[PDB]
Amino acid sequence: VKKFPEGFLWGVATASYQIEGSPLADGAGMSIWHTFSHTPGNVKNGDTGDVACDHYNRWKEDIEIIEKLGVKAYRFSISWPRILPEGTGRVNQKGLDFYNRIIDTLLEKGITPFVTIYHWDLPFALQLKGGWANREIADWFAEYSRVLFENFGDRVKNWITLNEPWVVAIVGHLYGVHAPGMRDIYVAFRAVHNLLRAHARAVKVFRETVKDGKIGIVFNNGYFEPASEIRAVRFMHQFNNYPLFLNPIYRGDYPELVLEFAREYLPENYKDDMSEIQEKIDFVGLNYYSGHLVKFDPDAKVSFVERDLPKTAMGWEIVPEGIYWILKKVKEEYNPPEVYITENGAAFDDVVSEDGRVHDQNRIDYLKAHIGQAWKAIQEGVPLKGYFVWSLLDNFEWAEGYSKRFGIVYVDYSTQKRIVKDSGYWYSNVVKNNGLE
Ligand SMILES: CO[C@H](O)c1c[n+]2c([nH]1)[C@H](O)[C@@H](O)[C@H](O)[C@H]2CO
């Protein structure tokens, strides 16, 4: 058997725009994902977050699912424009009420809330002012965060400033594939920098406002391997994984190969902000899904090489030892006091059999394998305090729309019926047992 430490936090994870629907209900401001998805060509099948999982109405049912599964922590995000419709200034009490009900319900049922402050749904009003491109976002984000701390910090004690700032900056402002849908390398790296400054200002406000909680930040990570017998792998790690942000946070500068590729794109006096950026954090959240074979390619001088390996419906290579690797490497490089796996999961072509069940043995195999590799890292001293399945529900998968299903619970979108998948039942047993058998 593989048993986890006593008090280890088994969770599931969602994000506001992906599950809620009703983006304009009860006085909410538009977000950049509302305007991005309502722009033709941006999202597969013209899908939007207008309805999604209707979690905005069905929130109590979904929490009852969490409870019934015996899952101990719930990671969810707050929609900034439900709280502050113009991004700053006015506070919307109905936005606060919505999350207050979710928070109290969780606590009442003994589920630990993990709140992601920003999971990509920036108020549109602030995008008009430059969004992440604008240095003033450090103030806007701090003011938003202060509101959340004041209203919920009595109850929520576990906070995440940002989900995947690399994706926010690069995918949103260089690749143009995510909101706000831009393609400018100089903008993209000013967003990287400003995300760091906004994060640190929010951590600083947290210390003034919530004297009894913990705060961290979440990063996407891939397991990169070299196609042969390696610097391209070093680059991909420093650029795509946690070092892009953790080197500034812990060592007060960007990683070396990031500076080689991108120095010219960063502000000229960016080191002036580095000492504020080193605001002390309580934990690092690492998201992990996939491995990649990498080679130098002259024609960022890196290309991916396809491998004949099992893949998910995203076409992502299933590489479980990656989660062990990234856990080891974070300890070795930055030694944060706590680590959580804040997302791990897989998309498969889920079908409801005529027995009424969803026989996702592919997902069970995926999760089991990665949970085992996370166990290993704990045995070798990684201070891993928790693990979160992405996702509780099938949901709006950004530019893929509804076509990719990551849930341990199946959502039939024509009825909004929730059907717990085999993987959900399987995970419930793991949580009950506090590990694998
Ligand atoms: C780029 O990092 C990860 O591949 C990643 C995967 N995922 C994520 N990040 C995001 O945090 C979620 O909002 C996605 O729904 C989820 C599934 O795609």
Swiss-Prot record:
- Give the pathway listed in the UniProt entry for this protein: Glycan metabolism; cellulose degradation
Q: Does the keyword tRNA processing apply?
A: no
Could you tell me the EC number(s) of this protein?
3.2.1.21
Q: Any idea which UniProt keywords this protein has? A: Carbohydrate metabolism, Cellulose degradation, Glycosidase, Hydrolase, Polysaccharide degradation
| Database matches in InterPro entries | Glyco_hydro_1, Glyco_hydro_1_AS, Glyco_hydro_1_beta-glucosidase, Glyco_hydro_1_N_CS, Glycoside_hydrolase_SF
Q: Which reaction does it catalyse?
A: Hydrolysis of terminal, non-reducing beta-D-glucosyl residues with release of beta-D-glucose
* Broadest EC class assigned to this enzyme: hydrolase
Mention one GO molecular function.
beta-glucosidase activity
Family designation: Belongs to the glycosyl hydrolase 1 family.
Q: What is this protein called?
A: Beta-glucosidase A
Q: What is the lineage of its organism?
A: Bacteria, Thermotogati, Thermotogota, Thermotogae, Thermotogales
State the gene name recorded for this protein: bglA
